[model samples]
Target chain A: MRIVEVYSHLNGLEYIQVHLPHIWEEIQEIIVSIDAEACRTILYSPVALNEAFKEKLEAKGWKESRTNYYVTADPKLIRETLSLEPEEQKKVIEAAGKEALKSYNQTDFVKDRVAIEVQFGKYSFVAYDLFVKHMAFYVSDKIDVGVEILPMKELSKEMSSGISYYEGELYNVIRQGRGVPAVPLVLIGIAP
Target chain B: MRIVEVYSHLNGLEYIQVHLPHIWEEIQEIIVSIDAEACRTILYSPVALNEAFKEKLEAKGWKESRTNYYVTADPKLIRETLSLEPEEQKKVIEAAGKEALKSYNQTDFVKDRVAIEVQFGKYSFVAYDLFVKHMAFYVSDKIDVGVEILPMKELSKEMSSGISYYEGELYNVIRQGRGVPAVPLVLIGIAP
Candidate 1:
């Protein structure tokens, strides 16, 4: 895979470029290091593409991270499901109403104070990764800025019909305007 | 008020123009007929603007429409929460697990197989409107297509901080790729 484009939302790249330049460079290196042709197995298989992205990032010392959210039925409200500890999450859920759900948001990789989510899935998953998951980690002070990795349209065209690509996800974030998500994010698009 | 721009998602405008031209004309008439200045109250009150949109549409014979969903914690799973009857929804929810919750998605206006959502709120609301709510109606065979009316960027700047505008939402729908939403949708941007 190769880096095709990158968008800095809420000055996410600016923050990383200045404060976490090393982490930023590592991300670029890892993305470029992957051989897209080597990843190909079955035609139109997102699973194969995703696995390749995952294995490469994991090999580079990036760890998976998750943030639990006690979400209510309402979209506007978010509750205290911040703790990674199960007991703390259970106690919080018990206190909330029956509609409150113990849902979690996950990112594929995190190192230092930066998170990266590599998406080659459904369009909605990219939306959640960008809008919901990234924001959760930012609000909890878990990471300085989030980075999302996606295949460009050329790459996704061979994978699946409804998969989200770099251009679409970038437009979605840019459509949210400059500071809507409140979390600083770097959206990177890659192709081979 | 005026219609600044209209986007046809999955040929939504084309669908309406070819099949339900009368409904299409009514939407245009109602949008053009709204009084934006009259709706303005406080400096940045979304309440006043929303109320105005509601009254004008209602007066023009557009009715509020809702679709119930027995939503599980998983975003992928949408269960049998159709049937507007409360008893039917109750029975469906009971049959589902304890984690299941009965939630209803609403559109501001509907008439003759077409639904319209007037968004002057947050950016995420527009996402839900285009992605979740509209798809629900289309899948349930309640409407042929959905229309989303939003203030243009020029209009949203004067309202609240995070309100979604035409340009942003348009980019979002476009980013979803041609037929990702699986519903024909007309996204309209309005200005005063």
Candidate 2:
């Protein structure tokens, strides 16, 4: 089985500390690249960040100085894991990007600042739904593939206050370093 | 504005004899067609009919044997209306058919006659919602429409026995009919 990971960070340190472990062991044997500061800048600026999310991030540890970044497995790693050829990988990524772009554009969050603020809590909820749908589509053959979310120290005092107050116990249970126990499925979030 | 009149047997005679003259005089011309049998069929069929609605129709002298025909507009009148080439009219009819088909295809109604009997009230509620959504889309731009549900004879009897019931009403209020003195809008209904 091939492992794939995705991560977003406000300052390079938090994402590197929290999300890096899941992919580090796999990266040593396969394609690995750091996507630093991709998400941090996005957390602060008008490019994509809305006022509410910015406030949320500012409360978390994100500052004007830090950049936004997300790390994911390279196309080659994904292709190899999925047993797809290079051409197939390109096609799949292109198609997925097209769909993502279409959804992003059509979404009211693209323009409305207040609506985005009010709805920011739903982003992770939606992301979880999308992940489940993707697994249902691609991982049906596997009986025991596990996915887990980890927690790390808050980067700043402000960041600590803005962290989601829900899912604290679930986060602790999964992050116990025992490797998340088998269950039907689980989602975890850090508590404020 | 064009006036399309749908007549139900229970009210059609009174509607034509009492209401048509004034509407005809005001509109300068009008077309009348009988859809009483079809209306009665719709009021009686378990497909979309509620027992309460059937009982109400029965009170008005509707017989079960008289309700077999499909309720629809006269072919020549339909042709004349379609002559205007309004794409929206065609779309509304298509949407109406789709709504009806969804009700007809409900598995609970097909697999068990007894369950359908037990679940008729729930099914009627579903039909009502579907009908409202379809009709809302249908007349949204053309007119201010309000739907009213009336009791049928069978449904009235069943409901009197503590069984759930349904009745139906649909009104197309021309934009000018709103507010103040509350000018009347043309009300349409289906009979037993």
Candidate 3:
């Protein structure tokens, strides 16, 4: 992968990371389409890059929000994992709605067996992407692996001064001993 | 009003605040039902209070959403208020959608001629309540005045440790010289 950098703790355990060739090409094509220099004061959003990629990828037959990633992770899994009652879930659902599950399960851009997400939100969201969503799809036999795209550290001047990427996200999962994320994953960061 | 606190600053401010008899009665009636001592965690949410008061308010002939509130502030107003061209407005509108307007103009509950917003968000939202939505509705002759209900300091536990109320918000407008909120206004803080 020609990404600025990548990180993974899933390498030696029940997972092995690899770059699916077709996805990389599609990503490059999307980057070419978006003249990053053209957009000033780039909107402050976690999915800015993802939406950019989604727009161009549409021409390549990539679909959005087609996968039912949360249909399987029911209240049972929520209770087991977070020990939260269904009523509490209602608040989160109210606060986030589709966004609550977008990182945990829904893929921003999905094409057949490959899925992609652009992460630039918070450190905790980066953790959730790896811990919950990526692992959920992997174990459920939904896809081969997942791709997480983020702003390279010190790059993306238009975005907020500091947005997270693989290094901080991986360091957190390791430091806290927060388990899961046993999926074959690719962490891609963009520079400038 | 009769119980909590109030503030305003405009037109040399002959604004000797007095309790709205009907609103004060409703407030006291709702407080009686909340069992303030029984619940350990009071969700720092306007909806928490709104929904609680709503159960009793239903019989009082008070309708909901009352007006669409979306008519005036479509694109032209979004552009005018935000000072953005159409394309940029598209990004903000697309990025936030209803959530953007929720803070900008829409009140949580409005009935008769009085508009009410139960604000438990950040201090910035208090500024918006007074600056944009409240002022916009007032100047357009939409309502007689605007009322803001926020969490009294130390009263809300599950919400942010601290939130904005009338005094601090009024103090800020006085200090910043932002030159706004010329409308007659009332600020009410609620506590358990």
Candidate 4:
């Protein structure tokens, strides 16, 4: 596998290059280091390919990151809707005069104030990653920038019918115009 | 071209069959009537296919529908943001006690309390069609149900790269779970 194309949104690549050039180099190194042929054990399957990328990134000291959100709703409404212990319910109501529900989002890899998401799933997940997940992390000061890695069309063709490809998502971001996602990000397309 | 798969979200197909069977039948007729070979004039181009579908639908009295939204903002904010005539500004401020900005959304075809979007475009357009456009029409009581027509994966492969397909959009809708969009929808997949 190797980096086939790159699109820098909001000067994201430039920012990474100026502030943390080694991180970008590490990403390129990891992409080229993968043996795509070894990963293509099963035809039209993404599992092996995804695992290969994940294993290499994990070994390079990249780790998963998660953020949790607790939203407060009416205590009466929450009591009617959710199953919770009495003590837990009381604690939530006392803290905010309402019931709170905890939900979380997780990203694949994070290191050095930068976030990376390797997308091999459905297209909508990429939408979420760009619009919601990455924005959340950036706003919370967890990461200065976000990076999205996707398979180019040729690679996606060998994987599955509906896996999102580089060309499509890049078009989507371009359609959004500039500064829409409001996050500094780099989009990388990979092929073998 | 032909209808290959149909997924009914929130009993959308059932409602349409009971209330507007002729409309549903018309969609099927229009799809199958297309000569895909004739439309595929240029290899891997969607222009001909899109035009063909539009022509058939227009012949059957299905017309484009648009909905406009007026949002009220602070008068000071509006004056700084947009250039407006004094008379028009007065009318808007008097009517809403603020400044108003107008934005509109258009759908491809609508008839007899049902809205349909023929999406041969990118994947994000389909997401907007399902979550935003359709819900807007439904919430305004302009339509009872929404329909989305998309290419199956096989047809997408023959047309162009990055076109949204049936299996992927269906998976997106399913992942949203039942009734998340709060709009009755029928997702139709077509192939040749």
lDDT tens digits, residue span B151-189, model 4: 877788787677877765664454332354677888888
Q: Which structure among the candidates has the greatest lDDT?
A: 4
Best by DockQ: 4
**TM-score-based ranking:** 1, 4, 3, 2
**A148, model 4: CA deviation in Å?**
0.8
Per-candidate iRMS values, in order, are 15.5, 28.5, 22.0, 12.8
Worst 10 residues of 1 chain A by lDDT: A71-80
lDDT of 4 by residue, A94-153 (tens): 566543444445787998889999888875678768755676567555788999999877
Task: Rate residue A106 of model 3 by lDDT.
Answer: 58
Candidate order, lDDT descending: 4, 1, 3, 2
User: Which lDDT tens digits does candidate 3 get at residues B88-191?
Assistant: 44456556542222212345555555566666665445654554455555544465566666654445444555455443443334322223345566666566
**How well is each residue in A29-95 modelled by candidate 3, as lDDT tens digits?**
6765764444334444445555555667787877654323221112233323232333444445444
lDDT of 2 by residue, B105-169 (tens): 12111110100111233322422222222122222222122122333324434333322222211
TM value for model 3? 0.39
Q: State the TM-score of candidate 3 restricted to chain B.
A: 0.58
For model 4 the local lDDT of residue A35 reads 87
Per-residue lDDT over A51-118 for candidate 2, one digit per residue giving the tens place of the 0 to 100 score: 53444434433333111111112322232223233345345645555210100001221110101111
